[PDB]
Amino acid sequence: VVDPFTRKEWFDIKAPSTFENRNVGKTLVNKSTGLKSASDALKGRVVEVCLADLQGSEDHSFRKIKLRVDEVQGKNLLTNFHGMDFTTDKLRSMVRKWQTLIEANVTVKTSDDYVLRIFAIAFTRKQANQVKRHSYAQSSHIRAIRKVISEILTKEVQGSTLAQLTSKLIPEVINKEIENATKDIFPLQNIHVRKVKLLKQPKFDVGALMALHG
Amino acid sequence: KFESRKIMVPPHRMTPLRNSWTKIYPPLVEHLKLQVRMNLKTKSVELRTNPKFTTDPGALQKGADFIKAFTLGFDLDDSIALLRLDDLYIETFEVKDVKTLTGDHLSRAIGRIAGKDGKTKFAIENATRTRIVLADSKIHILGGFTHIRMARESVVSLILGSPPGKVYGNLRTVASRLKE
Amino acid sequence: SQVFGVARIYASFNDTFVHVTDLSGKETIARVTGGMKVKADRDESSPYAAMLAAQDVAAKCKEVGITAVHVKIRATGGTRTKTPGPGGQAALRALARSGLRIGRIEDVTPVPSDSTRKKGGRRGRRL
RNA sequence: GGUGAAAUUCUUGGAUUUAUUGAAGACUAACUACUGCGAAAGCAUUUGCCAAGGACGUUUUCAUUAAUCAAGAACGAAAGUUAGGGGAUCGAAGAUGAUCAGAUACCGUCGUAGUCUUAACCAUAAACUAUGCCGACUAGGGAUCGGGUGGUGUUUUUAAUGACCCACUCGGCACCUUACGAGAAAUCAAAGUCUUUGGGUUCUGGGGGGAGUAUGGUCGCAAGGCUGAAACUUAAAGGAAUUG
């Protein structure tokens, strides 16, 4: 009988400073050996957590964050932002009959030269005095709106850091900026940035990672 | 301390829920000692365990399943069995899982399950002690585990195209087995 | 303190898996399946077998020291059916009564944008 | 793993399951409807380039230039043929497991050709709205798609535009009620304006079998396509609807 938990060891995960509270929880690894060091088994190891926990506010409950472990010190694992996504039950609740679904996406490089891809979604809605049932839009409108949205996303990136972008997504200010630009074209509802996925990353330095923390 | 569950209601079920509301909460407030509230801001209901007098975690799950079933379209007095009995489950699938068919072929299939005046559906819900709802392409079956499987095999054969009369013959046999 | 794990439940026809891991998902605490707890094949999918599997896993979690657990529920998906069968529902009920604190719950069944061809030929096949 | 039940198969060198990544080929879910486009077959991720088209608007231009159509010609689902590429998935043929069990009675594993694409062929479907094209007239109604006109109307803002509301109008896919009409009846705004029988024009049928056979011709590499009898036999075959 091995009972491997004789050999396992526990570490604490420390989210970056951008988030309101940062004790994520624990993970376990076998005790280190001269043959191979444990710290190499900790590196990578993405963690996925509900944003409503990091912020302590349940209105965020349908959004999820990925964190990737990049550094180890003193049995604390120091970790960096890695992606954002919706929960699947929420997304199914938006799609309904008698309306149009609009999507846009673009790939772009941050000022600290991460390369990422970002997805936006929006839906048409009725005017308050409408009588006809189904609120569809013509294709000339859809192309126009999709062009507008693509422009905004490519200027909100080139924020000075990947961390500055994170500070934009939490208060979801960008949803309001898209709302203002499309105002003239068509009435829209449930404007959301749906997903963010990180494609490539620069040469590592500890300096930036320590600057994000104590 | 605290733990809670939240479940969304689709919009066509919203109005039936309000009309029933006065009948649905008393069993949750009384029998299970849960506390519950309706959140219109996010079109959901939320259920909370009161720490002072709840018995065991089975109370919290029983509450959720009862509300869950109602949003699928089962009647209130059919859903309520999930509080009082303990062996009930829901099975669900959609016709494209069995055979791919699209136009009037698709419409004819679900019409073959209903039968005239629902008589074919009504018969299956009697020869097997179960309840069935048809929501366009999707079928949901409520009952006991062994009963579920007997219902499923019969309805699958209707969408594969067997004539309704032949299936009646099979039901009489299955119903004889459940005389036990 | 709570020390959350995460429980992965995979329900299908023919069998049900119960599986639980560290929050990072790499290290596995315990597994076991319905088929391990019953004699005959025709029973591997039964809800009864699912309850036995869940009770067994929960005991070992307390022994290692996990006290709370997020849960991810999965059906076979792909070209197959997408909603977790009754075997998965039974497992979830049994975990709740174990005294573990259930965290958030999510459905993670894989869905295609649009699929490759389904098995069983043109004339259909009994699911 | 798979079934009604089970066996072939994979696995302590770690199967099934979990995590981080990568490659290939195919497909385009939900939104998706009694909605749109095209001569028909048919057509659904984003952006760019190329050329085409209907309806509307018009106090522009030509001035009978038109309708239908034997010969002749372009296109034509799926499967199929020849040569090159690609080859994830599913899978005629083939090799295999069980042969027990009446609801589940025909199920399991592997897999060639094929499924995708380029260059040439083939010319069939319940290719169906089972309703030939062009023109005129005969009835009531509220919905919807594209264009246009009007409004001292709502909203985006302090204009124009956009979104919406109300009235009218040209064109289109449909729907509900009724029958002065019609019909064998089911039913039908045409299937009406027919013994009170004539607006123009193309194609096809003449009781049931023998038979889409035989023979001749012609097209195709082939599979096959188009055209197509008679001797003889028989008193019915067939359509719609209700009912014992």
PDB file of C-alpha atoms in Angstrom, chain A:
ATOM      1  CA  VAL A   1       0.000   0.000   0.000  1.00  0.00           C
ATOM      2  CA  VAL A   2       1.480   3.307  -1.122  1.00  0.00           C
ATOM      3  CA  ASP A   3      -1.147   5.655   0.345  1.00  0.00           C
ATOM      4  CA  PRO A   4       0.446   8.485  -1.656  1.00  0.00           C
ATOM      5  CA  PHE A   5      -1.018  11.200   0.592  1.00  0.00           C
ATOM      6  CA  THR A   6       1.822  10.307   2.950  1.00  0.00           C
ATOM      7  CA  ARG A   7       3.981  12.076   0.350  1.00  0.00           C
ATOM      8  CA  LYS A   8       1.717  14.966  -0.701  1.00  0.00           C
ATOM      9  CA  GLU A   9       2.221  18.609   0.294  1.00  0.00           C
ATOM     10  CA  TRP A  10      -0.128  21.618   0.267  1.00  0.00           C
ATOM     11  CA  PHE A  11       0.376  25.076  -1.257  1.00  0.00           C
ATOM     12  CA  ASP A  12      -1.678  28.275  -1.194  1.00  0.00           C
ATOM     13  CA  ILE A  13      -2.703  30.114  -4.370  1.00  0.00           C
ATOM     14  CA  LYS A  14      -2.372  33.912  -4.428  1.00  0.00           C
ATOM     15  CA  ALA A  15      -4.369  35.809  -7.057  1.00  0.00           C
ATOM     16  CA  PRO A  16      -2.910  39.027  -8.509  1.00  0.00           C
ATOM     17  CA  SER A  17      -3.539  42.431  -6.945  1.00  0.00           C
ATOM     18  CA  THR A  18      -6.162  43.482  -9.509  1.00  0.00           C
ATOM     19  CA  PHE A  19      -8.777  41.410  -7.657  1.00  0.00           C
ATOM     20  CA  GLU A  20     -10.482  42.478  -4.448  1.00  0.00           C
ATOM     21  CA  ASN A  21      -9.601  39.388  -2.376  1.00  0.00           C
ATOM     22  CA  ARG A  22      -6.849  36.991  -3.237  1.00  0.00           C
ATOM     23  CA  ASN A  23      -6.683  33.821  -1.094  1.00  0.00           C
ATOM     24  CA  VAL A  24      -7.876  31.395  -3.771  1.00  0.00           C
ATOM     25  CA  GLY A  25      -7.443  28.117  -1.909  1.00  0.00           C
ATOM     26  CA  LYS A  26      -5.067  25.170  -1.890  1.00  0.00           C
ATOM     27  CA  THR A  27      -3.586  22.519  -4.162  1.00  0.00           C
ATOM     28  CA  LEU A  28      -1.405  19.536  -3.323  1.00  0.00           C
ATOM     29  CA  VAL A  29       1.720  17.976  -4.843  1.00  0.00           C
ATOM     30  CA  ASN A  30       4.000  15.110  -3.879  1.00  0.00           C
ATOM     31  CA  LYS A  31       7.002  16.015  -1.741  1.00  0.00           C
ATOM     32  CA  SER A  32      10.095  17.075  -3.671  1.00  0.00           C
ATOM     33  CA  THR A  33      13.091  14.848  -4.394  1.00  0.00           C
ATOM     34  CA  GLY A  34      16.573  15.258  -5.776  1.00  0.00           C
ATOM     35  CA  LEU A  35      15.345  13.380  -8.844  1.00  0.00           C
ATOM     36  CA  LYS A  36      12.909  16.155  -9.750  1.00  0.00           C
ATOM     37  CA  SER A  37      11.830  19.294  -7.910  1.00  0.00           C
ATOM     38  CA  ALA A  38       8.181  19.900  -7.077  1.00  0.00           C
ATOM     39  CA  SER A  39       8.227  23.485  -8.357  1.00  0.00           C
ATOM     40  CA  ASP A  40       8.410  22.266 -11.956  1.00  0.00           C
ATOM     41  CA  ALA A  41       5.151  20.383 -11.377  1.00  0.00           C
ATOM     42  CA  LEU A  42       3.490  23.556 -10.084  1.00  0.00           C
ATOM     43  CA  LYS A  43       4.372  25.702 -13.100  1.00  0.00           C
ATOM     44  CA  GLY A  44       1.602  26.019 -15.664  1.00  0.00           C
ATOM     45  CA  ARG A  45      -1.354  24.407 -13.895  1.00  0.00           C
ATOM     46  CA  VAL A  46      -4.174  26.780 -14.792  1.00  0.00           C
ATOM     47  CA  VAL A  47      -6.901  27.309 -12.178  1.00  0.00           C
ATOM     48  CA  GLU A  48     -10.498  28.281 -12.952  1.00  0.00           C
ATOM     49  CA  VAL A  49     -12.614  30.255 -10.493  1.00  0.00           C
ATOM     50  CA  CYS A  50     -15.902  32.151 -10.440  1.00  0.00           C
ATOM     51  CA  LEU A  51     -15.425  35.915 -10.585  1.00  0.00           C
ATOM     52  CA  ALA A  52     -18.135  36.447  -7.956  1.00  0.00           C
ATOM     53  CA  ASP A  53     -15.748  34.954  -5.394  1.00  0.00           C
ATOM     54  CA  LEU A  54     -12.821  37.227  -6.247  1.00  0.00           C
ATOM     55  CA  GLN A  55     -15.077  40.295  -6.012  1.00  0.00           C
ATOM     56  CA  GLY A  56     -17.498  39.208  -3.287  1.00  0.00           C
ATOM     57  CA  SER A  57     -20.560  40.202  -5.320  1.00  0.00           C
ATOM     58  CA  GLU A  58     -22.961  37.697  -6.843  1.00  0.00           C
ATOM     59  CA  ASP A  59     -23.874  39.857  -9.844  1.00  0.00           C
ATOM     60  CA  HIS A  60     -20.602  38.575 -11.342  1.00  0.00           C
ATOM     61  CA  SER A  61     -21.601  34.944 -10.796  1.00  0.00           C
ATOM     62  CA  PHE A  62     -22.005  34.124 -14.501  1.00  0.00           C
ATOM     63  CA  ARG A  63     -18.386  35.095 -15.342  1.00  0.00           C
ATOM     64  CA  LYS A  64     -15.296  32.899 -14.902  1.00  0.00           C
ATOM     65  CA  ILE A  65     -11.559  33.648 -14.735  1.00  0.00           C
ATOM     66  CA  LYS A  66      -8.533  31.482 -15.512  1.00  0.00           C
ATOM     67  CA  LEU A  67      -5.318  31.968 -13.517  1.00  0.00           C
ATOM     68  CA  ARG A  68      -1.959  30.462 -14.501  1.00  0.00           C
ATOM     69  CA  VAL A  69       0.786  29.723 -11.963  1.00  0.00           C
ATOM     70  CA  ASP A  70       4.045  31.431 -12.952  1.00  0.00           C
ATOM     71  CA  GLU A  71       6.155  31.666  -9.787  1.00  0.00           C
ATOM     72  CA  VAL A  72       6.687  29.907  -6.452  1.00  0.00           C
ATOM     73  CA  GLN A  73       7.952  31.294  -3.167  1.00  0.00           C
ATOM     74  CA  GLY A  74       7.543  30.266   0.455  1.00  0.00           C
ATOM     75  CA  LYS A  75       4.817  27.692  -0.234  1.00  0.00           C
ATOM     76  CA  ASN A  76       2.786  30.464  -1.905  1.00  0.00           C
ATOM     77  CA  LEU A  77       1.984  30.117  -5.607  1.00  0.00           C
ATOM     78  CA  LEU A  78       2.012  33.425  -7.479  1.00  0.00           C
ATOM     79  CA  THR A  79      -0.192  33.487 -10.534  1.00  0.00           C
ATOM     80  CA  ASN A  80      -1.300  35.601 -13.483  1.00  0.00           C
ATOM     81  CA  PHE A  81      -4.434  36.309 -15.517  1.00  0.00           C
ATOM     82  CA  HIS A  82      -5.124  33.795 -18.268  1.00  0.00           C
ATOM     83  CA  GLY A  83      -8.647  34.185 -19.727  1.00  0.00           C
ATOM     84  CA  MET A  84     -12.304  34.982 -19.163  1.00  0.00           C
ATOM     85  CA  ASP A  85     -15.488  33.128 -20.094  1.00  0.00           C
ATOM     86  CA  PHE A  86     -19.248  32.885 -19.538  1.00  0.00           C
ATOM     87  CA  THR A  87     -21.123  30.045 -17.890  1.00  0.00           C
ATOM     88  CA  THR A  88     -23.077  27.898 -20.332  1.00  0.00           C
ATOM     89  CA  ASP A  89     -26.452  28.224 -18.593  1.00  0.00           C
ATOM     90  CA  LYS A  90     -26.342  32.020 -18.858  1.00  0.00           C
ATOM     91  CA  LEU A  91     -25.590  31.996 -22.572  1.00  0.00           C
ATOM     92  CA  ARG A  92     -28.550  29.735 -23.381  1.00  0.00           C
ATOM     93  CA  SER A  93     -30.838  32.166 -21.561  1.00  0.00           C
ATOM     94  CA  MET A  94     -30.110  35.019 -23.976  1.00  0.00           C
ATOM     95  CA  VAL A  95     -31.020  33.266 -27.238  1.00  0.00           C
ATOM     96  CA  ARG A  96     -34.741  33.522 -28.007  1.00  0.00           C
ATOM     97  CA  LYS A  97     -37.120  33.497 -30.950  1.00  0.00           C
ATOM     98  CA  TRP A  98     -38.108  36.664 -32.795  1.00  0.00           C
ATOM     99  CA  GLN A  99     -34.818  38.541 -32.647  1.00  0.00           C
ATOM    100  CA  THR A 100     -31.460  38.755 -34.403  1.00  0.00           C
ATOM    101  CA  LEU A 101     -28.153  37.553 -32.925  1.00  0.00           C
ATOM    102  CA  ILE A 102     -25.036  39.582 -33.810  1.00  0.00           C
ATOM    103  CA  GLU A 103     -21.445  38.452 -33.214  1.00  0.00           C
ATOM    104  CA  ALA A 104     -18.064  40.093 -33.764  1.00  0.00           C
ATOM    105  CA  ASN A 105     -14.501  39.088 -32.946  1.00  0.00           C
ATOM    106  CA  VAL A 106     -11.004  40.457 -33.522  1.00  0.00           C
ATOM    107  CA  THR A 107      -7.385  39.531 -32.776  1.00  0.00           C
ATOM    108  CA  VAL A 108      -5.077  42.240 -31.474  1.00  0.00           C
ATOM    109  CA  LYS A 109      -1.815  42.846 -29.590  1.00  0.00           C
ATOM    110  CA  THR A 110      -1.531  44.513 -26.184  1.00  0.00           C
ATOM    111  CA  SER A 111       0.981  47.266 -25.476  1.00  0.00           C
ATOM    112  CA  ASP A 112       3.011  44.810 -23.373  1.00  0.00           C
ATOM    113  CA  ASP A 113       2.788  42.568 -26.479  1.00  0.00           C
ATOM    114  CA  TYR A 114       0.521  39.811 -25.406  1.00  0.00           C
ATOM    115  CA  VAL A 115      -1.552  38.607 -28.360  1.00  0.00           C
ATOM    116  CA  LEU A 116      -5.180  37.803 -27.606  1.00  0.00           C
ATOM    117  CA  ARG A 117      -8.558  37.278 -29.277  1.00  0.00           C
ATOM    118  CA  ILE A 118     -11.787  38.798 -27.967  1.00  0.00           C
ATOM    119  CA  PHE A 119     -15.460  38.023 -28.674  1.00  0.00           C
ATOM    120  CA  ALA A 120     -18.511  40.289 -28.403  1.00  0.00           C
ATOM    121  CA  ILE A 121     -22.229  39.505 -28.667  1.00  0.00           C
ATOM    122  CA  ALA A 122     -25.390  41.613 -28.916  1.00  0.00           C
ATOM    123  CA  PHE A 123     -29.129  41.224 -29.541  1.00  0.00           C
ATOM    124  CA  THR A 124     -31.805  43.426 -31.096  1.00  0.00           C
ATOM    125  CA  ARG A 125     -34.782  44.598 -29.035  1.00  0.00           C
ATOM    126  CA  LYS A 126     -38.192  46.188 -29.508  1.00  0.00           C
ATOM    127  CA  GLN A 127     -38.998  49.845 -29.153  1.00  0.00           C
ATOM    128  CA  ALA A 128     -41.320  50.543 -26.247  1.00  0.00           C
ATOM    129  CA  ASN A 129     -44.316  51.303 -28.486  1.00  0.00           C
ATOM    130  CA  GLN A 130     -43.838  48.464 -30.998  1.00  0.00           C
ATOM    131  CA  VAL A 131     -46.799  46.363 -32.083  1.00  0.00           C
ATOM    132  CA  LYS A 132     -45.295  43.900 -34.552  1.00  0.00           C
ATOM    133  CA  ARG A 133     -43.887  40.881 -32.820  1.00  0.00           C
ATOM    134  CA  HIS A 134     -40.431  40.070 -34.059  1.00  0.00           C
ATOM    135  CA  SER A 135     -37.854  42.894 -34.048  1.00  0.00           C
ATOM    136  CA  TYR A 136     -35.590  41.630 -36.887  1.00  0.00           C
ATOM    137  CA  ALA A 137     -32.972  43.828 -38.573  1.00  0.00           C
ATOM    138  CA  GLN A 138     -31.822  44.099 -42.192  1.00  0.00           C
ATOM    139  CA  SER A 139     -28.373  42.875 -43.205  1.00  0.00           C
ATOM    140  CA  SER A 140     -27.181  46.371 -44.119  1.00  0.00           C
ATOM    141  CA  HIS A 141     -27.541  47.235 -40.431  1.00  0.00           C
ATOM    142  CA  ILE A 142     -25.703  44.133 -39.228  1.00  0.00           C
ATOM    143  CA  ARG A 143     -22.582  44.792 -41.299  1.00  0.00           C
ATOM    144  CA  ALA A 144     -22.520  48.411 -40.140  1.00  0.00           C
ATOM    145  CA  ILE A 145     -22.802  47.473 -36.461  1.00  0.00           C
ATOM    146  CA  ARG A 146     -20.190  44.731 -36.774  1.00  0.00           C
ATOM    147  CA  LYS A 147     -17.765  47.258 -38.257  1.00  0.00           C
ATOM    148  CA  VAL A 148     -18.347  49.699 -35.388  1.00  0.00           C
ATOM    149  CA  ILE A 149     -17.792  47.071 -32.695  1.00  0.00           C
ATOM    150  CA  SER A 150     -14.583  45.791 -34.278  1.00  0.00           C
ATOM    151  CA  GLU A 151     -13.153  49.314 -34.272  1.00  0.00           C
ATOM    152  CA  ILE A 152     -13.809  49.902 -30.566  1.00  0.00           C
ATOM    153  CA  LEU A 153     -12.247  46.635 -29.407  1.00  0.00           C
ATOM    154  CA  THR A 154      -9.043  47.359 -31.327  1.00  0.00           C
ATOM    155  CA  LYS A 155      -8.582  50.706 -29.579  1.00  0.00           C
ATOM    156  CA  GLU A 156      -9.443  49.518 -26.078  1.00  0.00           C
ATOM    157  CA  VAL A 157      -6.560  47.158 -26.506  1.00  0.00           C
ATOM    158  CA  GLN A 158      -3.281  49.039 -26.596  1.00  0.00           C
ATOM    159  CA  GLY A 159      -4.060  49.750 -23.022  1.00  0.00           C
ATOM    160  CA  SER A 160      -0.663  50.066 -21.434  1.00  0.00           C
ATOM    161  CA  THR A 161      -0.761  46.625 -19.808  1.00  0.00           C
ATOM    162  CA  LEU A 162      -2.630  43.359 -19.829  1.00  0.00           C
ATOM    163  CA  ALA A 163      -3.477  44.292 -16.230  1.00  0.00           C
ATOM    164  CA  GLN A 164      -5.068  47.553 -17.365  1.00  0.00           C
ATOM    165  CA  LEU A 165      -7.394  45.570 -19.619  1.00  0.00           C
ATOM    166  CA  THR A 166      -8.425  43.445 -16.636  1.00  0.00           C
ATOM    167  CA  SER A 167      -9.328  46.657 -14.821  1.00  0.00           C
ATOM    168  CA  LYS A 168     -11.623  47.505 -17.733  1.00  0.00           C
ATOM    169  CA  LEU A 169     -13.432  44.159 -17.857  1.00  0.00           C
ATOM    170  CA  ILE A 170     -14.468  44.017 -14.194  1.00  0.00           C
ATOM    171  CA  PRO A 171     -16.613  47.203 -14.165  1.00  0.00           C
ATOM    172  CA  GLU A 172     -17.649  46.208 -17.723  1.00  0.00           C
ATOM    173  CA  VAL A 173     -17.382  49.806 -18.895  1.00  0.00           C
ATOM    174  CA  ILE A 174     -16.842  48.698 -22.510  1.00  0.00           C
ATOM    175  CA  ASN A 175     -20.431  47.461 -22.728  1.00  0.00           C
ATOM    176  CA  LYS A 176     -21.554  51.052 -22.211  1.00  0.00           C
ATOM    177  CA  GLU A 177     -19.209  52.413 -24.885  1.00  0.00           C
ATOM    178  CA  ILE A 178     -20.590  50.036 -27.522  1.00  0.00           C
ATOM    179  CA  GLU A 179     -24.086  51.011 -26.396  1.00  0.00           C
ATOM    180  CA  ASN A 180     -23.396  54.673 -27.188  1.00  0.00           C
ATOM    181  CA  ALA A 181     -21.910  54.075 -30.641  1.00  0.00           C
ATOM    182  CA  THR A 182     -24.661  51.801 -31.976  1.00  0.00           C
ATOM    183  CA  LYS A 183     -27.389  54.029 -30.510  1.00  0.00           C
ATOM    184  CA  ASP A 184     -27.975  55.642 -33.911  1.00  0.00           C
ATOM    185  CA  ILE A 185     -28.218  52.411 -35.906  1.00  0.00           C
ATOM    186  CA  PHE A 186     -30.492  50.005 -34.047  1.00  0.00           C
ATOM    187  CA  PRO A 187     -31.756  49.401 -30.496  1.00  0.00           C
ATOM    188  CA  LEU A 188     -29.694  46.642 -28.877  1.00  0.00           C
ATOM    189  CA  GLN A 189     -29.785  44.709 -25.606  1.00  0.00           C
ATOM    190  CA  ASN A 190     -27.571  42.344 -23.599  1.00  0.00           C
ATOM    191  CA  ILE A 191     -24.365  43.748 -25.041  1.00  0.00           C
ATOM    192  CA  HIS A 192     -21.558  41.656 -23.565  1.00  0.00           C
ATOM    193  CA  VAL A 193     -17.912  40.831 -24.090  1.00  0.00           C
ATOM    194  CA  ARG A 194     -18.379  37.072 -24.160  1.00  0.00           C
ATOM    195  CA  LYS A 195     -14.889  35.590 -24.142  1.00  0.00           C
ATOM    196  CA  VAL A 196     -11.176  36.399 -24.017  1.00  0.00           C
ATOM    197  CA  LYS A 197      -8.518  33.870 -24.992  1.00  0.00           C
ATOM    198  CA  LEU A 198      -4.764  34.401 -24.873  1.00  0.00           C
ATOM    199  CA  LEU A 199      -2.904  33.145 -27.947  1.00  0.00           C
ATOM    200  CA  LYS A 200       0.772  33.994 -27.373  1.00  0.00           C
ATOM    201  CA  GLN A 201       2.853  35.607 -24.660  1.00  0.00           C
ATOM    202  CA  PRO A 202       6.166  37.482 -24.423  1.00  0.00           C
ATOM    203  CA  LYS A 203       9.483  36.569 -22.853  1.00  0.00           C
ATOM    204  CA  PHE A 204       8.956  36.002 -19.137  1.00  0.00           C
ATOM    205  CA  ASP A 205      10.237  38.407 -16.508  1.00  0.00           C
ATOM    206  CA  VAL A 206       9.708  38.196 -12.756  1.00  0.00           C
ATOM    207  CA  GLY A 207       9.784  41.988 -12.460  1.00  0.00           C
ATOM    208  CA  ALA A 208       6.285  42.528 -13.823  1.00  0.00           C
ATOM    209  CA  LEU A 209       4.901  39.569 -11.866  1.00  0.00           C
ATOM    210  CA  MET A 210       6.299  40.831  -8.565  1.00  0.00           C
ATOM    211  CA  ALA A 211       4.990  44.314  -9.361  1.00  0.00           C
ATOM    212  CA  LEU A 212       1.514  42.758  -9.493  1.00  0.00           C
ATOM    213  CA  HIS A 213       1.911  41.532  -5.914  1.00  0.00           C
ATOM    214  CA  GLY A 214       3.733  42.121  -2.648  1.00  0.00           C
TER     215      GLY A 214
END
